[PDB]
């Protein structure tokens, strides 16, 4: 937990924008406008989750990130819940394969807009 400015919280390898109550890509160009030198320096020494590792994950992303879920606005989204309680993306069409143990669920999550306009979802497992 590091408050690198009054707006920006670093916690659990995430940069949290406390005005928007939402995580920000540490590589977001907008930070070139918002951060002071010493604050950018702090973040670079800080070892953060790379948002690119998210790009071709097909299901939502489970996290242990207590601070992130505490300080971020959450939406409820339709998912398939497995027997182990991991969430999976709903197929927007017939999938055919017998999966009696997977069921539709409205789950709380944190949307993140990825680099390439792809939307991902973080939730605590």
């Amino acid at each position: 937990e590091e408050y690198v400015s009054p707006r920006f919280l670093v916690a659990d390898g995430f940069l949290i924008d406390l005005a928007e109550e939402k995580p920000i890509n540490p590589k977001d160009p907008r930070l070139l406008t918002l951060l002071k030198d010493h604050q950018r320096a702090m973040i670079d020494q800080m070892n953060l989750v790379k948002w690119n590792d998210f790009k071709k994950y097909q299901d939502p992303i489970p996290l242990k990130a207590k601070t992130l879920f505490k300080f971020c606005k959450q939406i409820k989204k339709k998912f398939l819940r497995g027997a182990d309680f991991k969430l999976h993306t709903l197929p927007t069409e017939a999938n055919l394969k017998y999966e009696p143990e997977r069921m539709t669920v409205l789950a709380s999550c944190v949307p993140i807009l990825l680099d390439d306009q792809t939307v991902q979802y973080l939730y605590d497992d």
């Binding site: 408050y3 690198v4 009054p6 707006r7 005005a19 406008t33 918002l34």
Partner: protein, 195 residues
Amino acid sequence: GWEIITTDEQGNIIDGGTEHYLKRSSDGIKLGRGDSVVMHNEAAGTYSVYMIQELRLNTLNNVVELWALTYLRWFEVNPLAHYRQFNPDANILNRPLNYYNKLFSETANKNELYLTAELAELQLFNFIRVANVMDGSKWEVLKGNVDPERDFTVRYICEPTGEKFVDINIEDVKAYIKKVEPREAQEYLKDLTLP
């Protein structure tokens, strides 16, 4: 989808040959000198609030310039400058700079604005809604019934850098802004924060 309405000191003047305000066709939102507006701020990645300071009709153009005074939101405060000012034995500190960030972020009223003397041109297509900006007393009235998206309180004018806080009566500022010449108004509010 906004109209221009010009009036003398009271009644409207027709188009065929003095205060200006804007009216929205949809509902009837009126915007003029003294009103506060919540504005989309694409560069900041979050919204801003301003008090309208002049609806300059730009005959230069046949177009309308909406000039406003910029509010600071809580996260734009200089938390060290704020602390040092309000704790005089806190110009001799001993804490980390990030402790002051945590302290301010954690105890500030996130719907307290701080007036500044800095003008912005506002574009109507960025308008989100009217701000309800009240003084510290009017804010005690509403405590458990405020809408965090419209309702705001002001205690201070300060410098755009988020320091040098000076107690103001905001309701008195609205009435001042809608009375005197814009140039005089801004220059006076600019002097309020200087030694």
